[PDB]
What we know:
This protein has four helices and no strands. By secondary structure, it is mostly helical. Helix 1 (6-19) crosses helix 4 (65-75). The protein is globular. Bound molecules: calcium ion (2 copies). The PDB classes it as metal binding protein. The entry lists the keywords soybean calmodulin, plant calmodulin, calmodulin isoform, target binding, Calcium, metal binding protein. The assembly is monomeric.
Amino acid sequence: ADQLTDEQISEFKEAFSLFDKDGDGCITTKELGTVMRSLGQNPTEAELQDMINEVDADGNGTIDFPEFLNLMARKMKDT
Ligand SMILES: [Ca+2]
Ligand SMILES: [Ca+2]
C-alpha cells in the first residue's frame, strides 16, 4: 500500500525467513501454525489451508516470499 519501503520489505523478509525453520523458502501450515499457535492464536486445520489457499494465487499450498508480501500487504489493511 502506498508503495512498500525497504524497511517494510527487509522487515517482512526477515520475518518470513524467520518463520522458515528449515530456511527452505517455504512456509507450511505447521510452521505457520507453530507461529499462530505460539501467537495466542489457534486456527483450525481447514482454516489454515483455506487461509493459505486465498493467497495461493499459484496453487502450491505453501508460502513463498512474494506470496507472503501479498499476505502481509492485505493484512496491513489497518487504515
Ligand atoms: Ca519450510
Ligand atoms: Ca502459494
